[PDB]
């Protein structure tokens, strides 16, 4: 019910996030040399 609060009306415009050639580069979370790839990706995600 009305306990959700926020805007009563508030229709309008939505826009996707900004992007650059670096966006989606995860090369430090990809590949392996010590462990299993999901675990180094988990370390790479935890600080981010």
């Amino acid at each position: 019910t009305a306990s959700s609060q926020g805007n009563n009306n508030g229709g309008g415009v939505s826009q996707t996030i900004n992007t650059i050639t670096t966006t989606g580069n995860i090369s430090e979370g990809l590949k392996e040399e010590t462990s299993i790839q999901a675990e180094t990706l988990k370390k790479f995600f935890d600080s981010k």
């Binding site: 900004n18 992007t19 650059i20 050639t21």
Partner: protein
Amino acid sequence: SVTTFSGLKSIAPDGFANSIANFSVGLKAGIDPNPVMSGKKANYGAVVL
């Protein structure tokens, strides 16, 4: 007779007597004017002495 701080010899040209304590000054950023590939955003760096 290994050389230590009390005996280290400075020839420091950059206006400091001492030749052991680092210093830094005038950090400044700037947008590269050099075009980047379309759908990527303008590059920027900074430098500091």
